[PDB]
Symmetry: C2
């Protein structure tokens, strides 16, 4: 009847980043498909990241197409308020039409997929024919073995009725959730709990989501049905591990062919995760976007996506991306934008770390210095970017910088 | 395919106090209270939280379902601004203690008091999408107020659970009949763990702006819609009855453009029913509109199917106006939950008991890592009423919450 999914998607992978191994030295042989991690500056927040992710999408839309954006869901665990959604600020600085539902969803790293699935149902519901939605997953890590791994990033996803970049397979969904005692975020500016069960639950969910998908999609098969696979990816290493486990557990193939399957179906999805680090609720979208830019779509290919969030909830779902989709995605130049970011030295990193306190969950009044790390602003010369200028009686003021 | 509320129930606290009594005991200007239609406010005990409230709201709904119907619950959204964690959703704990099937999406939505409606509208679209035919969803709006001065007597605690599905006798929504409107505004927000801040200076102006613009958007999509004749009752986000009375008046002048003399009558026949339960509970934030909807259905007249119009607002802000039909059968279903009876059975705090509670509310405070709760800290309350089993917070251990059923 009516199709639904991603019409466009873009990644904002920070203004600044550091070299993961360098930071380990300055602080052995883990070395686990990490290379770079993005780092939120103090004049940056989840609004900044979300707006900067979504701006290139909105820029490319006509005035009429933009006014059809009628749902803006931001997905995060880096909330700035217990009641005010990040979506309010984002709605303002992207200049969206007021005829728009806006809110924030939260379930650890499942947030993005939850937001996306609700957006998809808005489209399929046809409660507003021709409408679009914008789902923005945005997370940052402020502040031992988590520090070099923990990133900052956002992925914006425009959803609608002509989804050349990722047309979902309606109803082809295996969702699974249950309460588990796991690493959570019970304190304002930090984490707590235990990643001791994390992997076990991720793998449990990974299996059970696919089995639920098979139950609703008869004939589905983990090896042949999917030409690429994308996973919630905190770091490449554990996804490589989880893929291996899936091929033994579920696909039940011989050990010798697994490395090949990983390289052809999963490695493309992992490219951008190495440039940015764990971006939590945006990690799966990042991997999806990596998959689409780094893979091959001479003809339409099916991609299977697994989403997981601690606590926990999870979902496995799938969609088609076409040659035209991949073309659209290339115009955003994600890789080029990653190449242009500013590399912190360890000394600069220390100035940032000691400065991150001035913007800390309770902060009522603060004025930010964009020159606090002198080189960064006037360093690249690109499209305008949003930054946090000040907090005044808890209300946030943002500024465009060219 | 139809969609909407198949059942709905309210949990209005274990304990409550008399609002005027609390104003006196705090030595406040009684005048600033006198026309606001407030009587009682519910108060979360320290052994209660948004999970407790949510679970207790939803339990009777789940009890009334067959095993098979319950296993079709595939979406659990909880709607709050009283979150307990930056990433772990209240839905995880609620999913556990209601015993739902693991084949279920779960998460939390947040936009001030719009949270509930946002959750409910996403749930409706799950049903209309037919991505899982026969599936149901459960949307639970749950908020509590822990502890500026003039908010204390007004600020309540409560939850409303809403089962959404394909045979909605209690509120069948009108698909696409939706006027949503939002924009950024500097308003009263919740930027600190256990409190509020900002300014209710623009709040009313924005609530009224939104109330008008949502209906105009609704008209734009529903040609022929009319604020007076189309809706046999109207429900609003209601923090307290007084401002909804005011906002209805304003709407009848601004939008319906009727003569001043007939407005009081229109308020009494179309709005006053919806305000009954709010007086018993106080402002329950994201659940307030659902509370008023439930009040409307229990207290109104549905000899024949009536259309109800609902206005949802949340500071910051976002808002939506939408409508549905409720049938005589719907109102019957709703009566089986005995909401009024449950409100009658709550424990009334004295001011001395209220002080013990207030000084105790600190031990359960957003950052709390380890605590053991005393259910006898206010001696009379537990073994007071004799009702179905109820969930309470027993302990927090390394940030993980443990809950207990008490018969």
């Amino acid at each position: 009847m009516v199709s639904a999914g991603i019409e466009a998607m873009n990644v904002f992978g920070g203004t600044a980043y550091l070299d993961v191994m360098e930071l380990a030295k300055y602080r052995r042989f883990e070395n686990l498909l990490m290379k770079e991690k993005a780092v939120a500056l103090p004049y940056e927040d989840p609004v900044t990241f979300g707006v900067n992710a979504a701006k290139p999408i909105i820029d490319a839309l006509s005035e009429a197409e933009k006014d059809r954006i009628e749902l803006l869901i931001t997905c995060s665990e880096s909330g700035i308020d217990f009641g005010k959604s990040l979506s309010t600020y984002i709605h303002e600085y992207l200049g969206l039409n007021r005829n728009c539902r806006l809110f924030e969803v939260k379930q650890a790293c499942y947030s993005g997929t939850a937001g996306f699935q609700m957006a998809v149902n808005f489209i399929l519901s046809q409660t507003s024919p021709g409408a679009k939605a914008l789902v923005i997953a945005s997370d940052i890590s402020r502040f031992s073995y988590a520090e070099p791994s923990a990133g900052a990033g956002a992925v914006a996803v425009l959803v609608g009725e002509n989804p050349e970049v990722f047309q979902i397979d309606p109803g082809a969904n295996g969702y699974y959730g249950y309460e588990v005692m796991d690493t959570c975020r019970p304190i304002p500016d930090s984490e707590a709990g235990d990643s001791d069960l994390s992997l076990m639950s991720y793998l449990d969910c990974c299996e059970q989501t696919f089995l639920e998908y098979q139950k609703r999609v008869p004939g589905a098969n983990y090896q042949d049905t999917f030409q690429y696979l994308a996973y919630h990816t905190p770091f490449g290493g554990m996804v490589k591990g989880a893929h291996r486990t899936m091929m033994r557990k579920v696909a039940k193939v011989k050990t010798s062919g697994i490395e090949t399957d990983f390289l052809t179906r999963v490695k493309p999805g992992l490219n951008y995760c190495q440039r940015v680090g764990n971006i939590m609720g945006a990690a799966l979208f990042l991997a999806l976007a990596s998959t689409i830019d780094q893979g091959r779509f001479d003809t339409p290919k099916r991609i299977g996506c697994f989403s997981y969030g601690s606590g926990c909830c999870s979902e496995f779902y799938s969609g088609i991306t076409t040659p035209q989709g991949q073309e659209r995605q290339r115009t955003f130049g994600i890789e080029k934008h990653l190449d242009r970011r500013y590399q912190l030295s360890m000394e600069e990193y220390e100035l940032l770390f000691k400065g991150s306190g001035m913007v800390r969950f309770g902060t009522r009044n603060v004025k930010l210095d964009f020159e606090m790390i002198p080189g960064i602003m006037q360093s690249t010369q690109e499209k305008p970017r949003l930054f946090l200028e000040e907090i005044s009686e808890f209300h946030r003021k943002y500024r465009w910088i060219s």
